[PDB]
Amino acid sequence: GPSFPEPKVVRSQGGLLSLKLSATPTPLAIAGQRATLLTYGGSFPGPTLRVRPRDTVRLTLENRLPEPTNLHWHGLPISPKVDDPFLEIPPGESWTYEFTVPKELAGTFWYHPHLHGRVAPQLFAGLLGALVVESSLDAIPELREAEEHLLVLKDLALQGGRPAPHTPMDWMNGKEGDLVLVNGALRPTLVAQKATLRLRLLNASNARYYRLALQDHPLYLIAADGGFLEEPLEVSELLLAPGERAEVLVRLRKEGRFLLQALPYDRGAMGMMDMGGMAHAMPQGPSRPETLLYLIAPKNPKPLPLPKALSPFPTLPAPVVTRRLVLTEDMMAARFFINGQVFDHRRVDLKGQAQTVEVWEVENQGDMDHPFHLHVHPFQVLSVGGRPFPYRAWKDVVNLKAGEVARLLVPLREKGRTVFHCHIVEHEDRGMMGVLEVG
Ligand SMILES: [Cu+2]
Ligand SMILES: [Cu+2]
Ligand SMILES: [Cu+2]
């Protein structure tokens, strides 16, 4: 097949993407070895759903797993009666998700389980896929003439031909795997045919971070989790925390082989050490550097000009309330808290007004990085750690290093009960989640 593997794409037809998707244990060939994963649509990653604004999505999820499951439409500003974090699909049963893609929307989104207490093993085992919302902006020459690829960044560990089980330490840290894969492939080769690449990036890992850097090249950020930037932003590297997405342009500068790497990054994961009366927690330190793929540039590359502008970011109304959410840890208990509480599905923690704007100050008082995710209501990151954000775009996950405060501008959209949680999904399963009600 193509040198660069990507998930099969399912496109809407006549304004309708109608698809049945089974969640099933699936024998596969993965990274040169045979293993049984949990998949949507028989593949790892699951199929990429490609839609346009105003399309209707009708996705029937059949649960063939031995435990209940559901779907989170991560990043989609739709109703939490559709993107329902409390719904349970029992084994053997099906549920049809039906929604209209919002008019003002573009970018890379994804789908995965969100059944509290069961997310981390199900996501680790392979249950995830991408959703791409096409935009009329994709027709501008500087994007249309680029070579486009999706990169699903997800790691894995295998034991006995199955996803490795979670250990106690995995529940504390979030589980990372030794197989650091792109689109389910081990260090694939991308032989570029054009000098400008448009790469849609998804961190679908439980806990692993990707400090992305392409050898000898900058990256041009053109979209964050939930939409385009106002104009391209040149960066030397790009950190993608669990759940985050980005889209970048790569302007290949000369012929040759260039490594796309996940550079060393210390997210605060912990181990245990005994040195005589010690028996205390000790930092794991930075991750070892990983090669993600090999990028082969074409002959005599002449990249396109970058687009001068992308999408103007909406002028938001003045906010009507300020929230403060504080994240803390009990590492040895593998318990994680928001404002001193663990998740309770019966307890509403915040009550807000639809079509108002709120300021959310999220403070990480733990020592680990925590990627904070809000369902249903995309936000604008104003600042993190006291540093202003260098661009305006919709996000739905924001990474907080130890001590950092993120200031978010949160327009409340659809009414109903939804959640916010750490997207180190082990921490969500272990309590780091709360309930927002919008009325
Ligand atoms: Cu998610
Ligand atoms: Cu969630
Ligand atoms: Cu966390």
Instruction: Give residue 278 CA to ligand 3 midpoint distance, Å.
Output: 26
- Mark whether 103 and 36 lie in a shared domain: yes
A 10 A CB-CB count for 215 gives: 13
How far is Cα 177 from Cα 434, in angstroms, rounded to an integer?
28
Instruction: Give residue 298 CA to ligand 3 midpoint distance, Å.
Output: 41
Q: What are phi and psi of 173, to 5 degrees?
A: -90, -25
How far is Cα 171 from Cα 424, in angstroms, rounded to an integer?
10
- What stretch of H or E contains 272? strand 270-273
Instruction: Give residue 115 CA to ligand 3 midpoint distance, Å.
Output: 17
Instruction: Give residue 114 CA to ligand 2 midpoint distance, Å.
Output: 6
In order of 24, 46, 187, the CA distances from 126 in angstroms are: 10, 8, 18
Q: How was this structure determined?
A: X-ray
Instruction: Give residue 272 CA to ligand 1 midpoint distance, Å.
Output: 29
Return the closest-CA partner of residue 302 out of 251, 345, 363: 251
Ligand nearest to the CA of 399: 3
Instruction: Give residue 72 CA to ligand 1 midpoint distance, Å.
Output: 7
Q: What are phi and psi of 371, to 5 degrees?
A: -85, 110
Q: After which residues is the chain broken (C to N over 2.5 A)?
A: none
Return the closest-CA partner of residue 428 out of 333, 348, 336, 330: 336
A 10 A CB-CB count for 244 gives: 27
Longest dimension (CA), the chain: 69
- Mark whether 72 and 24 lie in a shared domain: yes
What lies within 8 Å, CB to CB, of 315 at 6+ separation is none
Instruction: Give residue 276 CA to ligand 2 midpoint distance, Å.
Output: 42
Any idea which residue has 């990028």 for tokens? 295
Instruction: Give residue 224 CA to ligand 1 midpoint distance, Å.
Output: 14
* 298-303: Cβ within 8 A, 24+ apart: 298/192, 298/193, 298/194, 298/195, 298/252, 298/255, 299/255, 300/255, 301/192, 301/195, 301/252, 301/253, 301/254, 301/255, 302/195, 303/195, 303/196, 303/251, 303/252, 303/253
Return the closest-CA partner of residue 94 out of 17, 21, 37, 12: 21
Instruction: Give residue 395 CA to ligand 1 midpoint distance, Å.
Output: 12
In order of 243, 301, 429, the CA distances from 196 in angstroms are: 26, 8, 41
- What stretch of H or E contains 185? strand 185-186
- What stretch of H or E contains 227? strand 227-235
How far is Cα 307 from Cα 166, in angstroms, rounded to an integer?
45
- Mark whether 435 and 320 lie in a shared domain: yes
As a whole number of Å, the end-to-end CA separation of the chain is 50
Instruction: Give residue 111 CA to ligand 1 midpoint distance, Å.
Output: 7
Ligand nearest to the CA of 434: 2
On the 0-12 / 13-18 / 19+ scale of CB atoms within 10 A, 308 is exposed
- Mark whether 111 and 219 lie in a shared domain: no
**Helix, strand, or coil (residue 2):** coil
Structural domain count, the chain: 3
Instruction: Give residue 284 CA to ligand 3 midpoint distance, Å.
Output: 16
Instruction: Give residue 193 CA to ligand 3 midpoint distance, Å.
Output: 40
Ligand nearest to the CA of 422: 3
Residue 279 Ramachandran class (φ > 0 left, ψ -120 to 50 alpha, else beta): left
Ligand nearest to the CA of 418: 2
- Mark whether 288 and 333 lie in a shared domain: no
Ligand nearest to the CA of 111: 1
Instruction: Give the domain range for residue 79.
Output: 1-134
Instruction: Give residue 418 CA to ligand 2 midpoint distance, Å.
Output: 9
- Mark whether 232 and 187 lie in a shared domain: yes
How far is Cα 326 from Cα 338, in angstroms, rounded to an integer?
5
217 assigned to a ligand binding site:
no
Domain-terminating residue out of 134, 149, 177: 134
280 assigned to a ligand binding site:
yes
Instruction: Give residue 425 CA to ligand 1 midpoint distance, Å.
Output: 8
74 assigned to a ligand binding site:
yes
Domain-terminating residue out of 79, 113, 134: 134
DSSP-assigned states of every residue in 51-69: E-TTPEEEEEEEE-SSS-B
Q: Do 112 and 152 touch, CB atoms closer than 8 A? A: no
How far is Cα 74 from Cα 107, in angstroms, rounded to an integer?
12
Ligand nearest to the CA of 421: 2
- Mark whether 343 and 425 lie in a shared domain: yes
Q: What are phi and psi of 191, to 5 degrees?
A: -95, 100
- Mark whether 87 and 191 lie in a shared domain: no
Return the closest-CA partner of residue 73 out of 62, 94, 57: 57
A 10 A CB-CB count for 1 gives: 5
Instruction: Give residue 254 CA to ligand 1 midpoint distance, Å.
Output: 37
Structure-block tokens of residue 184: 């389910």
Instruction: Give residue 39 CA to ligand 1 midpoint distance, Å.
Output: 16
- We report the CATH number of the domain holding residue 118 as 2.60.40.420
How far is Cα 120 from Cα 113, in angstroms, rounded to an integer?
9
Instruction: Give residue 390 CA to ligand 1 midpoint distance, Å.
Output: 24
Instruction: Give residue 394 CA to ligand 3 midpoint distance, Å.
Output: 21
Instruction: Give residue 422 CA to ligand 3 midpoint distance, Å.
Output: 5
Ligand nearest to the CA of 130: 1
Ligand nearest to the CA of 242: 1
- What stretch of H or E contains 124? helix 119-124
Return the closest-CA partner of residue 47 out of 128, 148, 120, 107: 128
Structure-block tokens of residue 237: 């590297």
Cα-only R_g, the chain: 21
Q: Do 249 and 222 touch, CB atoms closer than 8 A? A: yes
- Mark whether 296 and 158 lie in a shared domain: yes
Domain-terminating residue out of 261, 282, 311: 311
- Mark whether 278 and 353 lie in a shared domain: no
- Mark whether 150 and 123 lie in a shared domain: no
- Mark whether 59 and 162 lie in a shared domain: no
On the 0-12 / 13-18 / 19+ scale of CB atoms within 10 A, 68 is middle
Chain centroid offset of residue 235 CA: 20
422 assigned to a ligand binding site:
yes
Ligand nearest to the CA of 372: 3
Ligand nearest to the CA of 426: 3
